[PDB]
Amino acid sequence: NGPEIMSKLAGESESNLRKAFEEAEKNAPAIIFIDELDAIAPKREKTHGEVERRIVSQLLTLMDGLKQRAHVIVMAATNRPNSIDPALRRFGRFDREVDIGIPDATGRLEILQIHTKNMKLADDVDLEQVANETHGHVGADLAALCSEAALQAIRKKMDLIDLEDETIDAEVMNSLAVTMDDFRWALSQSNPSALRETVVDVPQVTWEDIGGLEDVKRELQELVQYPVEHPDKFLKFGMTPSKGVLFYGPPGCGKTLLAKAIANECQANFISIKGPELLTMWFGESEANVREIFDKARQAAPCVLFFDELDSIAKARGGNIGDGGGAADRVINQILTEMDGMSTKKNVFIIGATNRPDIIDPAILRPGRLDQLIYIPLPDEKSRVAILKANLRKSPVAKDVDLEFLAKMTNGFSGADLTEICQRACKLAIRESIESEIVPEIRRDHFEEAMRFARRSVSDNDIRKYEMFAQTLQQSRGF
Amino acid sequence: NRPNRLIVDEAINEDNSVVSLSQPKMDELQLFRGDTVLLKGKKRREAVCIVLSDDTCSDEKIRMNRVVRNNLRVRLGDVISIQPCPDVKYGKRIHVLPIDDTVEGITGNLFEVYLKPYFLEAYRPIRKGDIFLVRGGMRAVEFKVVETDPSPYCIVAPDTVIHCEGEPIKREDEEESLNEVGYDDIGGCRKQLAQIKEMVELPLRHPALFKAIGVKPPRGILLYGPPGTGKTLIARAVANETGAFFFLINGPEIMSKLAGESESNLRKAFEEAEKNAPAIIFIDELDAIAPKREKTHGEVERRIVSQLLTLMDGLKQRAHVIVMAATNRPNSIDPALRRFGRFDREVDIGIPDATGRLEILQIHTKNMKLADDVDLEQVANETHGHVGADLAALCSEAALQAIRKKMDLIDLEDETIDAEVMNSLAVTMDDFRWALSQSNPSALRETVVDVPQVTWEDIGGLEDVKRELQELVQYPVEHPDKFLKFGMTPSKGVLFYGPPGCGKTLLAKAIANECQANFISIKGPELLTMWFGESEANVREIFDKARQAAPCVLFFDELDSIAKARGGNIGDGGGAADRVINQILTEMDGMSTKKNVFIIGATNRPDIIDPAILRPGRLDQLIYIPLPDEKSRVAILKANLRKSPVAKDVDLEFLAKMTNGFSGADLTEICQRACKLAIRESIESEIVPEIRRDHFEEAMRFARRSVSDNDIRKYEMFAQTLQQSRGF
């Protein structure tokens, strides 16, 4: 144990390490597990006492003194891998690194089953729903949630259980069952530890969540699925696949949904890094964080690395023209460096999205970094019908609602505008239900009233400017 | 089975021994309001008391006072055996004796000050060996009957004679000192006390059951909050209200020891706790011994932190040991301590609100005698940044001020004054006003998480935005079933934009008030100064604090100041997005949807607000607050003139039609100027107390318009085209 070793007196912890290694070498094949390795071996550049440096040097010597004949395997665990002294992570000391990441929905469902297999669950307990409703939770968080649910179940059974009795018998303990309400209460007051952690997972949104955009769907399929599914054709014809795609167009037209859906179809890991996130994570002058992003994407291959809201990055210094200076600062140079320095044979795909193509820096568009320029326009008449149908899948829409009428009544609306219209109509239906309580079907009148106050989020001049950039954006770089 | 067992928990009646039951219970046990009941406890002892009729207490619970809780030797959560006693009782002789642990320093005839105005008009029953508490004379003493007629056969009657002995008896170890801190000594923290009880008392009170079940007990409770909020008081109370051995570890006291001797003290404390039954280890000022190991100098301190981590990790479920810690700087604690298995439960003891601080004032003045003009509610309202320690200091200062005016009536030559004059000294409301006049609130800089007082009645007009805010906030928190039926996820953000002084802040505060939800106001200048220290964790702490207060509304006022830090969207060419705004967007995107936190932004510069704020999922409900029209101006004037004695001849609609481009702030300025003219008239006439029509005419003569016509046109332009914004 890290803290247990560090708690000893100076010159006594080294004896403990030597004794542990001697015992491991003596006693057959053995495993040495050093829990919380960062406790005893932090970076020697950032440490105060010489006793700590003696400890680190002793650990290095013991690791280097390991022979193949010893049949001794040393395992270590640390929640701060970057705080570990770099000398430990070299060859011969700690070469294999295993990342125990945050569990996904299926994994956390499995954890919930493992932790509730001892408990008795009521018939209304839906562990799948609980797993879906827990996002930032880890195994410890789920264990705490299960324990809290069991305690809540007990707290309502204090009368059926004779608290005067010293040791209750099992004929009543099994009668106490944990209801889904208890799990809901436990989930209501729970603090997920891994909320801030970046998510590496396959997104749930599929092509059915996207209306229209069939051509870009086909293009994304050809760009992503084919190199990962049929490498033989690519090596036969001799072309190296392009590793980057840039999405540009008016806001709210589905740039994020397209990246998530293409990640879903390939069943590849998806990492979303937003522009504001980069701007705050670099403000601490931490150049290793954006490098860690690319490293994390590398181990998740096949993976798609999606940089959303590049306009926020490009608006940090004004833009390409702006007042005269360039928008390239901070992360973007390191992002370009990482894109140029990533292995081609790796299955990592990089997708960028921005609704400000005017101010995107030219170096992003250079071939070899992001040379597949895909323009997502505003939906046309049929795409608007498709978008409305996709957004109204989960709502009980009445039969008399004419979706194509709404599509032809909206011309310059984007996908976000149509979603806003649907949400406003649903909110009017909710208000109607609330008023009638003091019917549960959204009607034609609700859509008419919502369309009365519907607003257009893209100007005609903006449409013209986007059309201009849709044709001439490859040029950009050069002047 | 046995419909006579009652669950024991603390009462709410601030009086002597009076038990309170639920509505079905007095009918089920055939006892009326003014009836005599008998309480039977453990160790073959009884108690007699008078029931109270209560309805909104619980389904099945008795209410047990702390005065006679020790009389039955029963603690919180215990089971008691009740019995109605329809036996007529009357006292003839009751030999009563105080205890010489709390009556020291009191002389004279203690009956006429303590017992005489406590017995009559009460008719309370007294049992053999009863320890009842009497407050008075700016101190509290408990009292003990030792000899009377056979038990109990005694009630308080005017026909009961008494005689003093002058030799109080000593206190044995069979009973617990009532002078010690209990649950009733803490005010303003009932939710936190409820959480602490739920997390602590069940494992401690039933260690065998918790060992039999084999489930994880929370053993890492960490109290935190501003200094003087009662963390130590809460820990000591929880220790006293449960039969758990309590071992106290002081941060500075441990750190003051020599190197290699503090570790011995920590090990000894943990060994004692493990050995002695269920136990509580309280480490007051945890940051003293365990700061961040990244920021620390000596290796002895790191040894201390590592030893603490090892001791915390060496805790087993069979040990039945709960470790509690208190720190006023939770962020200075080493992060390794706050992980799973060491300190997982965190309880925030925040600044008390007006009701909480009123409760604290009552708790601290219950010993003192207050004059009839003392309005503790007014004192609580007038104290904003005060904490429990601040209020205790205020009460002590008021008592000292009262004494300072009584130095002549009290013989300062006499060694020990008698209580017949001490009770005559009463603390006046003037003394409290003087104490409040010179007092330094410690928690002035702390952010306030409270339900605001301003309601819709403080806002004139704006009916449509009131309805829209109700639909946006109340409905998702009141009827989630409709939302999940229709499949729409509620929007979590609203942006207010419009001309200045039209009620953007009042709307957010009022919608917080109506929902009875916590309200956090963060102003733009506050963000700009709090980020200037390069503290990225502070705006994260704001969102974290809003998360625990759910349902809560997080209001960012004066976003123009944030947007004007770098000029604006166009400006000289650069963007206004800097510093906080990127982290604010990150926090908005990274907050849980099922949480009931609602985010409201306000700005009077919609031109320079950065587009990323308006993206769907962050702040997509764009609500425009215009200048008040004719009827809204009447409503605004009426709302502003609620507290003033406006004369009957004042025509408010005339003023409304005489003001066209005025905002709410302009009308408030007009009302204030008219009131100031009335004040000047009163002052001049002193060398009438009704603001008149002439005052309003004179104020309107100098009334000024704070929004230009060009500004009105520009706001109307942005009122129609602001969703566009983002994109070019």
Ligand SMILES: Nc1ncnc2c1ncn2[C@@H]1O[C@H](COP(=O)(O)OP(=O)(O)OP(O)(O)=S)[C@@H](O)[C@H]1O
């Ligand atoms: N093709 C589409 N089909 C269905 N919904 C869409 C479509 N395009 C946009 N939306 C809606 O618009 C929302 C925003 O989608 P995004 O992919 O984030 O759009 P965007 O192009 O990235 O622009 P922003 O800045 O993110 S709003 C989605 O959550 C949908 O509700």
Ligand SMILES: Nc1ncnc2c1ncn2[C@@H]1O[C@H](COP(=O)(O)OP(=O)(O)OP(O)(O)=S)[C@@H](O)[C@H]1O
């Ligand atoms: N909520 C409260 N109710 C009643 N009295 C209180 C309350 N908070 C504080 N007090 C009084 O103020 C005194 C000081 O409180 P303490 O608990 O000692 O301070 P603290 O909470 O430990 O914070 P520290 O020690 O300065 S970090 C207590 O002894 C009480 O007399």
Ligand SMILES: Nc1ncnc2c1ncn2[C@@H]1O[C@H](COP(=O)(O)OP(=O)(O)OP(O)(O)=S)[C@@H](O)[C@H]1O
């Ligand atoms: N609808 C209203 N009814 C009554 N008083 C109002 C109203 N609108 C504004 N006021 C007055 O104007 C003051 C300022 O209110 P705020 O809500 O802060 O206005 P604002 O829109 O936030 O603009 P500023 O920058 O804060 S003055 C209030 O304290 C009231 O005195």
Ligand SMILES: [Mg+2]
């Ligand atoms: Mg997006």
Ligand SMILES: [Mg+2]
């Ligand atoms: Mg303390």
Ligand SMILES: [Mg+2]
């Ligand atoms: Mg304001």
